[PDB]
Amino acid sequence: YNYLFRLFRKSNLKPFERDISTEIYQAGSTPCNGVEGFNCYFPLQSYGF
């Protein structure tokens, strides 16, 4: 589970854009204050190979 991929973003990458940021994603109406909740999600996922 050490290998990760991003599932969520505001908008698509430009060519060779390198977005390192791991802040909680606001997916909707909820203001997230830096913590998980309804429409407040952790943006990364893992393959679990």
Partner 1 sequence: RGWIFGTTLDSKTQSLLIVNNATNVVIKVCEFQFCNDPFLGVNCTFEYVSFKNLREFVFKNIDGYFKIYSKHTPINLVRDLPQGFSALEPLVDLPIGINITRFQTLL
Is residue 11 within the footprint of partner 1 (CB under 8 A)?
Answer: no
Residues in Cβ contact with 24 at an 8 Å cutoff, skipping those fewer than 6 apart: 32, 34, 35, 36, 40, 41, 42, 43
Q: Does 35 bind partner 1 (CB under 8 A)?
A: no
Q: Note whether 49 binds partner 1 by CB under 8 A.
A: no
d(CA 43, CA 28): 13
- Of the pair 13, 49, the CB lying nearest partner 1 is at 13
20 in contact with partner 1 (CB under 8 A): yes
Using CB under 8 A, list all residues that contact partner 1.
14-18, 20-21, 23
